[PDB]
C-alpha cells in the first residue's frame, strides 16, 4: 500500500543487574512490566512491522538460560502481533549466524539481517520494505583497519547501501548498530570503542533509519528520520532525567514521516546531592527512601567519618559515591 | 503451486523415513591418520534427503547423534545440520528427538523453532505432542529422551529403573489417546543387544523392548550405530548411522529406514542405503614379506579405508601409511 506504521524498540538489556559493585539489583520484573507496555502498545497501534536494534541481551557473550528464555519468549510475542526484524549486536559466537539465517528461512513473521546485503521483507499488511543493514563490522574491517581506509571502508559500504536504496519498491528502512558523531552526552565512553559514523553518511533515500546500541532516547536528524529509541529501563543514574520507552513511526508516500514515544514508565532513579553526611542528612535520607518507589543514589562531598550501613539498612539506596 | 499441507479426507495412510546418528562434524582415527568424512557423510545425506523426495513421504523422524560433538560442534557441522534440517523441512513436516546435549540452550532454541514453524518438532522432554503430517495425517508423538538426574547420580537401584517404568507406563496411556497415528521415539539401548557391539559402552540407559509401548504404530529408535529390527509389534528400528564410523561397523549395512502404515494392515518397510565407503581390518601375525605382498595388493584397488592388526614387531616397518593413502590404521 501507501502507509506503513512501524513500532522500533531496541536496548532491552535482558538479563542486567545494576550496581553489582555496592547492592546488587536484577531488573528482570521491571524489565518484563516494561517490555509488556510496548508489546501491548504495539497490539493496541496495530503496527504493519517491528523493528529491533541495539543490545536486547545485556551479556554480549554469555547471557544466562532466564535471559535468553526471555529473548526467545518476547521476540515471539512480537511475531505473534506484526513481522519482526532483527538487527544483532556484535557476539562472537559465528554459530549465532547459522541459527539467524536458520530461523529467517523457516518463519515467514521474522528476519535476522547479519550482513551488509539488503533484505526485501513483507509488512503485515502487504507492504514491501527494502532493509539496508549497517551492523557491526567483521574483521574485515578490524583486519584492514588503518583508520584512514577504515573510514574509506565504511563510507564504500554506506554508498552500496544508498545505491541499492534507490532500488527500493515501496519503503526503504535503514538499521545501524553504532554511534553517530558528535555526541557529547551519552556518550558512555569508550575508550574505545564502538564505530564513529557521521549522521550526512546516512542514505537521505531512506523513509527511515533505525538505530540502536544508545541508552537514552536521541532524535539525531529529519530528513531522513534518524531515531535511537533508548532502553525501557533506567539501567543507571545517567539515565534518571530520561524518559523510557520506544518508538512508533508511520510512513506515507507522499507525506512527510511523523513519530511518537511510547512511554513504559519503568522505575524512577533519584540522586541525592549532600555537602557532608551529618545528624540531619542521615534522617533526610532515611526519610526519602521509605517513601520512594524507586532506587536512590546519594552523593557527597566532604568526608564524613565513619558512615552508618546505610547500604545494608536501606534496601532502596544502591549507590553511594 | 502451494507449499504447505495436504489435506485428504478419511485418509488412513501415513509414509514415514527414519534416519538417526549422522554424526556430522566427525574426523575418525585422529590417533593414527585423521580422515574428514563430512564429504562422504554429506553424500549419504543426499542420498537419503532424495529418496525422501522420490518417495513423498509425509513424515520425517530423527534420532541419535546427529551431530559427532556433543559439546563442542564446528561451526561446519552446525551449518551441515541447519542445512539438512531445512532440506528435510522442504519435503515434509520434521521431528526431531536429540541425543541429551551438554549447553542448556538447546532447549530453549528447540522449542522456539517448534513455535515458529509446524514443519519441524523438537521432542526435549516426557510429554506427548500432536503434529501434523504432509497430507494432514494427525500423528501422536511419545518420546522418551535421555533421563535428567536420574542418571547423576543414578540414586538409586531399581528406583530408577521404577522411574523409567511409570514414565513408559504414561507415554502407554497416552498412546491409548491417539486420534489415527501413533509414533514412538526413544533414545536409549534395548536390552538384550544381539550383538554388535555394546560400545558405546558407556555409562548407559537399558530398556527391555516389552517396556515399549505396544499400541503405537512404530517405535523410533535411536543412538546405536548398527542397523537392528528389534521387534515386529510394534515394530522398532535403530536406523543406524549413515556411514561406517570405526572398523567395528565393518560388517555392517548403513542407510535410513522408510516405513508405511495403514490403518487395518500390519507396517511394512523398505530400507533405504546409503552406500557409504566400506572398511576393511587386515590380519597378521607379523608383518612380513608375505604381509607386505598382502596389504599393498589389497589396499590397490579398495574403495575404502584400510586397518591392519599385527601382533608383534620384527624389524623396522616400511612407510605404508605414506605409500598407501587407504592405510589409516596399523594400530
Ligand atoms: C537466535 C535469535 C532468534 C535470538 N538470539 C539469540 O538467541 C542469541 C543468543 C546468543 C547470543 C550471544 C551469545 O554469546 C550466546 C547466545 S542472540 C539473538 S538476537
Ligand atoms: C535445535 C536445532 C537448531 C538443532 N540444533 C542445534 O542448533 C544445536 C546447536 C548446538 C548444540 C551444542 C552446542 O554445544 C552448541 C550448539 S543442537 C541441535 S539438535
Ligand atoms: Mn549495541
Ligand atoms: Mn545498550
Ligand atoms: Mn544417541
Ligand atoms: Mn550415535
Redesign the interface.
Given at each position: 500500500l501507501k502507509e506503513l506504521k512501524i513500532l522500533h524498540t531496541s536496548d532491552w538489556h535482558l538479563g542486567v543487574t545494576s550496581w553489582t559493585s555496592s547492592r546488587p539489583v536484577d531488573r528482570r520484573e521491571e524489565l518484563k512490566k516494561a517490555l509488556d507496555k510496548v508489546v501491548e502498545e504495539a497490539e493496541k497501534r496495530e503496527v504493519d512491522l517491528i523493528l529491533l536494534t541495539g543490545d536486547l541481551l545485556h551479556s554480549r557473550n554469555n547471557p544466562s538460560?532466564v535471559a535468553?528464555?526471555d529473548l526467545?519468549d518476547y521476540?515471539?510475542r512480537m511475531?505473534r502481533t506484526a513481522p519482526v526484524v532483527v538487527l544483532p549486536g556484535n557476539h562472537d559466537w559465528?554459530?549465532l549466524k547459522?541459527?539467524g539465517?536458520?530461523?529467517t528461512?523457516?518463519?515467514s513473521?521474522?528476519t535476522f539481517v547479519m550482513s551488509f546485503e539488503p533484505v526485501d521483507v513483507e509488512a503485515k499488511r502487504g507492504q514491501k520494505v527494502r532493509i539496508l543493514p549497517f551492523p557491526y563490522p567483521d574483521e574485515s574491517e578490524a583486519l584492514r583497519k588503518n583508520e584512514g581506509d577504515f573510514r574509506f571502508f565504511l563510507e564504500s559500504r554506506l554508498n552500496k547501501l544508498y545505491e541499492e536504496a534507490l532500488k527500493k519498491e515501496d519503503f526503504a528502512i535503514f538499521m545501524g548498530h553504532f554511534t553517530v558523531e558528535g555526541l557529547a552526552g551519552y556518550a558512555g565512553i569508550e575508550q574505545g570503542r564502538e564505530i564513529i559514523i557521521n549522521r550526512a553518511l546516512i542514505p537521505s533515500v531512506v523513509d527511515y533509519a533505525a538505530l540502536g546500541h544508545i541508552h537514552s532516547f536521541r532524535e539525531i536528524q529529519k530528513q531522513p528520520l534518524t531515531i535511537y529509541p533508548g532502553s525501557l529501563i533506567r539501567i543507571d543514574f545517567g539515565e534518571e532525567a530520561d524518559e523510557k520507552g520506544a518508538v512508533f513511526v508511520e510512513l506515507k508516500r507522499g507525506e512527510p514521516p511523523r513519530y511518537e514515544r511510547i512511554d513504559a514508565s519503568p522505575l524512577p532513579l533519584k540522586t541525592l546531592y549532600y555537602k557532608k553526611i551529618d545528624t540531619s542528612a542521615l534522617k533526610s535520607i532515611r526519610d526519602f527512601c521509605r517513601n520512594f518507589p524507586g532506587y536512590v543514589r546519594v552523593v557527597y562531598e566532604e568526608d564524613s567519618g565513619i558512615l552508618p550501613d546505610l547500604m545494608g539498612e536501606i534496601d532502596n539506596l544502591v549507590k553511594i559515591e
Open positions: 538460560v535468553l528464555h526467545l521476540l515471539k511475531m559465528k554459530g547459522l541459527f539465517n536458520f530461523v528461512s523457516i518463519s513473521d521474522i
